[PDB]
Every structure is written in structure tokens, then in C-alpha cells.
Amino acid sequence: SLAPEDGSHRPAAEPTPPGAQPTAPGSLKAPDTRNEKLNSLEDVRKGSENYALTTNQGVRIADDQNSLRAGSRGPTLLEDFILREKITHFDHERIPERIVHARGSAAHGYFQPYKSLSDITKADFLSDPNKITPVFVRFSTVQGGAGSADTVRDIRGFATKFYTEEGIFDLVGNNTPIFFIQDAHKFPDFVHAVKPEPHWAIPQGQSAHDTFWDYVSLQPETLHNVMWAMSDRGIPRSYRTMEGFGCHTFRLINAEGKATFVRFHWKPLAGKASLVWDEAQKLTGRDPDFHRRELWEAIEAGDFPEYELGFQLIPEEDEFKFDFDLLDPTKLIPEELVPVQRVGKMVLNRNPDNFFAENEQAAFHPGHIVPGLDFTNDPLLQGRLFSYTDTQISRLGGPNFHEIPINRPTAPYHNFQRDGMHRMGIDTNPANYEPNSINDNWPRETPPGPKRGGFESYQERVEGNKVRERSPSFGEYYSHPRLFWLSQTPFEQRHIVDGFSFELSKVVRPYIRERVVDQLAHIDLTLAQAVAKNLGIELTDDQLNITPPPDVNGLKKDPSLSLYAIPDGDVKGRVVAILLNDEVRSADLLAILKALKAKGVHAKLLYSRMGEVTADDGTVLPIAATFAGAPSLTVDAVIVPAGNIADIADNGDANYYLMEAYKHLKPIALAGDARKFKATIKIADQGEEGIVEADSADGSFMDELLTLMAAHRVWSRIPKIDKIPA
Amino acid sequence: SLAPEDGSHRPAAEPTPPGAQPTAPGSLKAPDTRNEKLNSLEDVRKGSENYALTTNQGVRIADDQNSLRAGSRGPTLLEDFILREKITHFDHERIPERIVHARGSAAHGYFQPYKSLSDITKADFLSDPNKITPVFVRFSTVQGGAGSADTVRDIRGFATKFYTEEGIFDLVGNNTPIFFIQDAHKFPDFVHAVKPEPHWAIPQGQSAHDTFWDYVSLQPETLHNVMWAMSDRGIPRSYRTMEGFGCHTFRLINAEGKATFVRFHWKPLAGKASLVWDEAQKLTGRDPDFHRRELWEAIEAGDFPEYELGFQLIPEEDEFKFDFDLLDPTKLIPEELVPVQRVGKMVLNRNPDNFFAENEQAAFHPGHIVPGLDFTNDPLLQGRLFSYTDTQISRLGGPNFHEIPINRPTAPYHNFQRDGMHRMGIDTNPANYEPNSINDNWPRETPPGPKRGGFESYQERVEGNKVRERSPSFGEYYSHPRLFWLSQTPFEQRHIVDGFSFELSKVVRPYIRERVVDQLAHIDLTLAQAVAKNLGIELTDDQLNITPPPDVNGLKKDPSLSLYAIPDGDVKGRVVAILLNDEVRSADLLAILKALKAKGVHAKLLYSRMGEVTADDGTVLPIAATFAGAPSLTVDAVIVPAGNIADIADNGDANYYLMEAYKHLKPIALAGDARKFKATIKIADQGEEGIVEADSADGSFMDELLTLMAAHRVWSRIPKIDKIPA
Ligand code: HDE
Ligand code: HDE
Ligand SMILES: [S]
């Protein structure tokens, strides 16, 4: 017995806030959270308590501390089969990482539609509001390895595996509504350009290098998703606070055989929020696991990630009614033109048990559709259909990857396929071919029908010659970048300029920077000039006269493209740093902690050391982390209670905590004599918007703080930080 | 879509300083640099200029921009074999990363001994000072994935493949002289404990989490290598400025058959230097590729990494003469007791061409020895011999990994092994077995002897029963951690305390912290008290009375265990940031660059934007990076020349640049009105050791700065940095 007698090694099996208890496997943290998929995995879940340690062959091990040797200082013997099994398994633990989206964090949950969608699709999962579909979702970055950092500037993946009664449906989306390239044939060129360069394998998790910008400069189709990546969209606060999109026009197919074009949306019910660049970059160093950690802890805390599934629906007859081609994956469909219709709600409510087994081996692929859905001729989507099945053969070791437990359908599956590496299912069918008489032709084909029918493709008319040719309709590259730019707030536009400027400054060959600047001048002159100024580049008279691209169907902005133009803030699940001193005013802390609790906002009590401090009234205050150990990067706001301020007033880390949080536009609240820290961040006596201050933490001090937090960051402070040395 | 007319896309094929040219494949950067191994790879090197783009079958491609489809807006066709080859290759790019040391950076070079070692070993590569052996070296961290960051706190790997005339010898070392554990049977337990925890796969690149410290608290054998990891040895400045060690006692065997025990050492000719934790951690965010980059650039610049091979030699009759067991890999052999004998010099002078082909697929293994070397019964080394061959079967896809070009011996290899996946060699031998008459028994066994003989094991006597039992002589855990502790300077001790304090503060379960502090009390009470204080823990009376472990064979300290106690600075290949203004005083810059150049010290010119600024005399100065884009983390010292100081005096980034450099103990030099920045870092008029200042940058000013840089950091400043908010 090595566990502590007080049982403090084991986390409570109840929802607890971030940092209160060690984290655990989902079935141990939340044993009563169930769904049909989680239940169906019970056959392979393996426990441990009270069991004897064995080899894989079930042989009990007596000494797991020593190899077998001739004499206690002698050579190890080949007949040590316990040593060799154990080391063999270790020696083969690793499998190939995903070619792209290798870095990803995942969770189980469930989806339910708001109402039946039978008028527009025969998809069984969308047929009845009382139909619950288990999901498994993996969020990811794109470029970096499985051991790269979470808060890089990159697109994010948002993949949802729906375990439906009529088969697996994978909705394999991203956090922007378009992609960099038009045709799947170029995907290796694009990916190679953004990935670490091949001579030296640098840089990790970054597009800020020559080959990416070289490619972008020579392939203007990429400019739209580049605008998105350079904006604060490229640096989300949390997977809970970004949008999701299905990237392509697909089809819905109803029982009557009518096709409707659809683009898929996920709206984050926690709101849209992003970091700022300096914060995101520094955070890759201070906690490269920050998003994986935040997702896991939100789920353990009961702050379940929730998203609303939405559809943009376009009738068959309206295929050609836009300025852009619906099948072009570099074009978005503005919500002002085609609204998103609410469809249903997904809640992620349980972490996995074993990350490797459930997360690393999960296979998602957009060809996994079900009756009631179908594809289109989008030439990016068309190639994806090839890639996601082929790649599993090396990644997951062969064609039986659907038998890896997380991948298994909960719907029945029976067919005539046999064998392959790792074959688990033992087929008893006397036949392995059809048609057969020896088993009366079972399992049998099923006609298409309104429910429970076989899959049949929509009979779309095809007419043309066999060509390798880009549609002329796809040859417009600047209008959507422009629409995106004009839709952003002035502070968002500033962060876009700064992303381009920062990234191009890492491009070693100056001609590439110049070429990119030329492309910016084809989108918007103010943008092009601002980036040019940061790069010491002067636009030519010609570049000054490039006429801007047309409006998109008469639109000059669409506010749904902004993260922040329309408020959607939610504070629940956010976190506040509380900077302790050695004699805190206990009435300030009561008021602070209860107000945060009442709104679902977490707190972490920080100090210059671990252990405890004692408040004015003798209350013993447990310390979560030190100032340097849990930097302001990791919180949404900072509160300093009154008390013995002289304890920390000269602590460099405590001052720096506030400068860093100030620079990154976070709300800061100072009570009583904590107002002496005003001088550290240079705040005028009469105060400033975004700094909450009062004699004490009572009255409106906490409501004012929470109002700031609902608006995420203090954008008005941007001109003030510009000269802060932090 | 083509190269600029000025040819600026292509790096000069001459040595150039970091940042002067884009980096490039080694064979293009330094085509005249050769050795036998580099030449032998010519069969597989593939160029590209003037060649047609083809499928892998040699078919020229007409349109690499589009998929084949039925009409230009139609579905992609299955007969597009060009698309599917290209996509299939992409979909299968990744192979499993190494189970440990997945993150690593490699280069080519050569080794030669100083004199013949034939009195002690018959190894051919140590037999003649004029016999040059090609080497390929990979440096690594241990815990993190291939996409994790470089400047983590971790042990570093240092693996050298010697391509000798009598076979490949791989010396597979680390940058500390011991390991965490005693018996290879426990390697998977230790590695699992340090690696990301299995439920959520956090943390990456960090031992700062509950499972690692749980293991350490329960296995006091780990404490010696933990001491080393918590010291600044865990955060080297560069692979060029760390020591390497072979980890085990091996044997040398001479022609007469005499065995001598040996431990291997690499001495960095650029001297020993490490980061400080705050700097190392922030650098994982600002440049996760810093060590990989610095190595590649040092080789491009001609600052070739050089190491001296050294041997500790112990006669067979002295096996039992120390108070520790020679075969215990948790124990070091103090250089005060057994001096390192200089053996030869290794120079790394070319970067690879393709990181995947040469670095990622290289396989090193300590069982790859040659006649003249042999093993011992070290029970860690014993188990390693199983693992390094076994693991290659999944990692490199089969038993023909020696045919992968980087791995191939330059010495002849012929034997009766056949087949296996991706078999390259076509054997013509009528026989695939021996003995055979049908090929007159070729290839044939060769007797052992003085040179070019067959391998025979040294006939060590073995006497004991078949037991799984740890040698009693291995059961001492505290004396070597204490010797290490006592050998460190006071500032190195403070950093060790701070490493333990920071790490244990991230351990969520407090009892684990308490148990680690109790272990520390068995090593040194001063260390234990100082960690406990930081964790808010009070030592008990029993803990205060624990008797310190005994001295190691009479030693109270051994200064060769310290990074810094004995000066060994070398400034060549270091780098200074030079903070520009818009009217630099050219006279200052001229003298600065001249003094730096004379000592092989590089410079980076930084400003608040990219492009150019013009000096007082018309000199146009190109800007390498912005103050934010290349932070003081990345340089060794900072110089601010005179001129129009008002231009940058109020710049937040420029002021911060100095604050960060000051905090991290780096030399700072301020000329003319740049002395105004003294106010940002609180230097009194009188000045301060480690801040160089004068009316202008002259002979005297540069000499002082260069003197400080030879001592690496300004340790005496440590008391002054607590207060700086940076
Ligand atoms: C719409 C969102 C989107 C788009 C447009 C693309 N990816 Fe993804 N991807 C793979 C291939 C692939 C191709 C061929 C194309 C355009 C032709 C895209 N991508 C663009 C893949 C290599 O087959 C992939 C890697 C491993 C795997 O199983 O499939 C793959 C990954 C991926 C993910 C991660 C899913 C997961 O396992 O967590 C996501 C969210 C996307 N892609 C989105 C996506
Ligand atoms: C003393 C230097 C040292 C020590 C003591 C060990 N490693 Fe290493 N290691 C593998 C297995 C293994 C075992 C079983 C033990 C102790 C029993 C050690 N290690 C401790 C490996 C799985 O075979 C390995 C991973 C991938 C691979 O090809 O080999 C491996 C790697 C490794 C490297 C990396 C070499 C490289 O590719 O650059 C180094 C420097 C060590 N180990 C050193 C080492
Ligand atoms: S997409």
C-alpha cells in the first residue's frame, strides 16, 4: 500500500472546477454519464484495481523490478520472456501520426435535432427530435506534429463522428468556411508548402516561413483562407469559442428524391473568442497543451462544450444565382444572402479513458455519409473522398480500422468482406460472396426508400469531355478576401495587418514579401499600405491604382464574418487570476469568489510560493499556483484584493503579471490598497475604461468586472499598450 | 511563376553567417565538403533543375494543377492515376516516430584519433591518427514528440554513428553521465511515468507533472539523474555547448586480449553553457526550433560543432575498488578519481539534404560495436541491446533498415540473410546458407585477431544462479546526488532549487510533493529546506536529523560536475542583437562589427519594422528582424549604438528587449545616448559589472563586452533581477 491513507490520490467522481482535483479517465471521473456508444465500448474497457500484474498471456509476474540474469551482477538471459514481452510492447507503441491535423483533442457527447427535417432529408439522425445520436469529436490544428503546441496561428479542424442508426456519418470540418485551394490535386503542394521545410524540418506549427508565402504569392486562390488565418480566427481562445464549418456544398436528399444544396455550420454556444498574437505565441511556450487542457477541464467541471448545428440551404434552381460558384471551396456563402437555419444541438460531456486508444486511433472521413445526404462536384471534396480511406491503411495498419473500438458503428454491419491484418470479427456465414444460394443470399441488398433503405446516389446529370481543367467560374480570387476584410472591426483589421506583417517578416527572401504585398493591393489598398509600411516597402503608383474587386452580390460587409462586431459573450467556464498577499482582506475575497461562482466563472488563487496564506480574519487560503507558474496568459482577467499590498508590491513577477494581462487587453480589477499597482500599468488617478477600481470589492465592483469579461477584451486600450515595456 | 531575375532566391554556396542567406540542403550549400559516407550517398541523391515533372513511373505530367473530371465542373474520374499516385504518396508519408528521443537534429562530419590506441584497443577506427572515420550525429531531447520544442527541460541524447572500416559503431550517449534507473526491465515504467499521462496525453516535453514525481518519490534510484535534470544541465544553450557521455561501463579489448573497462565522454570545444529556466521556457514558445536552427546555422557559417572524445579507463583488477559498483548506471565515476584521457576530435561540417530521409530514418543502436570493443553486465545496457534492433521493425518497416541509405555501412557487408520487406540488395550467391559447398562456402567466417578479424566476445567468467534480483551493491541512492549538489556553484544550486520548486508546484497531489521533499532531506538538508520553503512545507524534526550520505571515496566535491566553476568560455559562433535607430552612428557600428568579426561573433540588426534604415553616413542597413520577431531569448548579448536614440527611447518593445536580456543575465552594452536606457533596467550612474557603457563603441568598450560574453552570463546580477517586472 503506496496510496496515501487519506485517499487524496483519487479525484472525486463529481464535477469539480479546473485545478481543484487531479484529472482522470472519463469513466472514472463521470461513471454515470452514458450514451449508446460509450456503453458499447464496455466490452473492451479494462480496469486494474485488485487485479494481479501479468504478462499479455495472462501469466502472473512475481518481480516486475528486475531482469533475469546469471548472478545478481551477471548478464541478462535470453530466456527472460517477461522482460522481452514488456520491452517488445514498449518498442512498438508508436503508430504513424495523421499526415495533417496530427495535433488534436477529443471528447464524447451526443446530438439531438430540434425538429424533424424529413421535408428536406431522409437522414435518420435528423428525423425526430427525440432521437439522440452519440458523437465523438476531435478538434485539431493542421500543420504541427502530434507533439506540437495548441495555441499556434493555424486553421483548426473540427471533426464530428455521428454514430447513427443507419451508419457512421462523419462531418469533417474546419473553423473557417473555406479552404486555401480549389482542386484536391494540389493538396500535397499546399501542405508541403505550409509544413516544415524539407532540408531542415523547420518551422513547427507555423506558416511564417518562405515556402508558404512563396506558394500563396503564386496561387492567389489561397488569399481568402490566408485572410482568415492572419485574423484572430487563427488563434482561438478555446475550442469551445470558435465556429465550425463543413467547407463544401453537399446535398440533402429527401424521401421524394429532391436534392437541396447544403453547407454545414456549428455555432459555439459559449460565444466566439480569440487570443491576441503575442499572448498566443507566448502561451505555446508557457503551456503548449493549453487548449487540450481547457477542453478536458471544462468537461470535468460540467461546462460542457455545446454547439448548434446549422444549415445554409440553396434550392437546386438557384445553383447559378451568385457571383461565385457554389462548388468553389475558396468561396463562402455570406449569411446575409443565405441564412443559417438552426438544426440541433451537440453537447460534449465526457472525456475519453485512454487518449491513444480513443483519440489517436479515431478515423474520420467525409466520404462516410448516410442515406439522405450526398456529395457534389466540388473538386476539393471529390479528391478528399479518395484520401481519407487510403491514408488509414498505413496509419491504422490495414483495412480493418473500423473494428478499432472507437471507430465501430453502433448500427449493424454485415457484408462479404474478409481477412486483412488485425481481423477481429469471426464470420460464420457459409458464403463470402454474393449472389449466393448457400446462405440464401444473406446479407442482402436493400432498396432505397424513405427510412432504413439502401444508399443510392442522386442521379445528377454529367455532361462534358474528360478534361484536367479548372472551371472559368472559379477564376476570381480577391472579392471574398475583400468582403472578409471590410466586415472586420477596426481592431480586428489591425490584428490582420499585424499577422501579415509578423509573418512576412520571417520570410527571408525579400522578393516574396514584395510579391505578397502586391497581392494585398488587389484586395484593399489600406490593408496593402499598412502591411507595406511595417515591412519598409513602398507601393508603386501602379499598385496604388489597382481597382478593387467587385462587391459580392452587392454586399459591402457582412457582420457575421467578424468575431466581435456583434456581441455574443458568455462568461461561464472563463477563469480569473486572484493575486494573493500574506494578509488578504477576507471580506473582499468572499465578495469576489461568490460573485464569480454565481456566474460559473472559475478562479485561481496565486502567490509567490505554494502552500497557504492567512487572511486578516484567520481564514486559511490554499494557493493554486505561483505567479510564474500560472501566467496571466492562462486566464481571462485578473483581480487583486486588498490587504497587505506591501507583501507583493515589490515582487517583480506580481507587477509583471499585471503588465502582461494589461498588454493583452484583459480586464483588471483592483480593490483598496491594490490600487497602488495603478502606477505599474500607468493608470491615471481618475481611472480608465477596462480597469475596475474601488475602495472595496463590494457594491458594483464585481458586476463591472463581469461586464468587462462578457465583452472578452478591452479593445479601447489598444493605443495605450503600444508603448508598454512588456 | 519563377525565380527573381536578380538570382536572390538561391543561397550562396559559401559559408555565411546566420540570417545572411536562406538556409539550404547541405550538398547545395557546401558542395565541396565531402567524406566517404557523404560520397556513397550519391547513388540516391536526386536533383531537380532542368528535369521534367513526372509520376513515380517516369511519365511526364502536362497539368499538375487539376484533377481529371467529366466537364470542367464535373465529378473527378477514377481513371486519374496521376492524381491518385500523388495523393497516395502524400497519404502515406508518415512513419512511426521514435518511442523516445523522437525530437532530434542531425549532421554529418568526421572523426580522427590523436594517436594510435593499439595498446588498449584493437578497434580499427582508433588505430591511426590519420585514419578519418565519417560520422553522422543526432542530438535529441527524450520525452517529447518529433514536433515538440527544443529548449525544454529534459535530458538530451547525443548519438554518433561511426562508419568504420570494420563496421558501424554507434555510440548512443546522453548529456549526463548516468541514467534514472538501474535495470532495463523498468524502462517502460520510467518512460511511461515521464511521458504525457495516458488519459489526456498532457504534458508535452515536461517532467513537471504528477506521474513523473510519483515514480521518482517511490524509486530513490532516480534521484541522481533528477538532480542533473533540475540543474541547468537540463536546458542547454546549444547542442554545441553540452557534454556527452556513453552512460555505461563498456570494455576495450586489445590485440593481446586484455580487457580494460571504459566510460566514454564528449567534451564540447565551444565550452559548456546553458539557458536559465524562464528564458528556456519562453523560448519554447518564441522559437520551438531554436536548437535545430542554431545547429544548422552554425554549420552553414563554418562554426562547425567540435567535440573531443575522452575515455575514463579502469583496469580489470580495479573493478571493485570504488565505493559504488562500476556496473550501476545511476553512479558516475568522478574525474577526480579517474581522469578523462583525450582520445580524438569529431567535427560536424555538413548538414543533411533531406531531414526525413537522413535524420528521421537514421537508426542508432549501442549493440552496434566493432572488434576491439565489448559490453559489460551493466543491467541497463544489457536490456538496451534487445530494444534498439527490435524497435526498427515497426519504425522503419522491417529488417532491411540497414539498406536505408543513411544506415548503410561503408565497410563491405555480405552474409546469407535474404528477403524481408523492401529488400534492396539482389544477392547473386548460389547459396543462402552455410556451410555450403556450392559456393565454396563464401562468404566465410574469419578468425579473430589483431586487425580485420571476426568478432569474438571477451571470455568473462559468469558464476551465479538464474535470479531476478538487484545487486546489493546497487542499493545506495543518495551519495552521488549529494556529490553533484556540493560540486555546483551557489548560483547553480539556486537554479537546482528553483527547478525542483517550479516542477513540484505543478504536481497536483500534495502528498507527492511531500514525499519528494523527504527524499531531498536524505541528500542535503540545505537543498531540502530551500525547496520545502518554496512549497510551503515544513521539515519535521526527524527530517532535520537525517544523517547526510557518505562522501564518494573521500570526495567533498568535484568541480568537473559544474557547468561553470572552471571557466571554459568560447565566444566564436555566439550572437549579439544590435538595436538600430533611424540614424545610427556609423562610427559606432563600424567598431562594433569589426570587434565581433575578429572573435567570430555574429550580429543581428534589429529595428521596429523591416526593410532598411540609413546610417549617419549614408550606409544602408538591412533589418534582419523586428524587436518582437527576434527576442533577446535568441541572442547572447545586446548592443545599442548611438545616433537618433529618441527614435527608439519610448518604444515598448525596445525597452522590453533590454529588460528581458537583463533578467536573463546577459551582457548589455550602451554607447553614447543609448545610455539613457540605463533607466529602464535601474543601473546607477556609477555603472554596474555586466553593463558596458561609454561615450562611443571603441576598442575598450568592445573588449569589455567580449570579456563578459566569454563568461557566458553575469551571475553576480542575480540578486538585482527579483525586482525587475519582466
Ligand atoms: C472542410 C474541412 C477540411 C478540408 C477542406 C480538408 N481537410 Fe483534411 N485530411 C486529409 C486529406 C485532405 C485532402 C485530400 C483535402 C483536400 C483535397 C483536405 N484534407 C482538406 C487526410 C490526409 O486524409 C486526413 C489526414 C489523416 C486522416 O484521417 O485524413 C485529413 C485530416 C483532416 C481532419 C482531422 C480529422 C481527425 O482525425 O481529427 C480535419 C478536421 C480535416 N481534415 C478537415 C478538412
Ligand atoms: C545512456 C544513453 C541512453 C540510455 C541509458 C538509454 N537510451 Fe535509448 N532508446 C531505445 C530503448 C532504450 C532502452 C531499452 C533503454 C534502457 C533499458 C534506453 N533506451 C536507455 C529505443 C526504443 O530502442 C530507441 C528509440 C527509437 C530508436 O530507434 O531507439 C532509443 C533511442 C535513444 C536515442 C536516439 C538515437 C537517435 O535516433 O537519435 C539515444 C541517444 C538514446 N536512446 C540514448 C540512451
Ligand atoms: S473547405
Ligand SMILES: [S]
Ligand atoms: S546511462
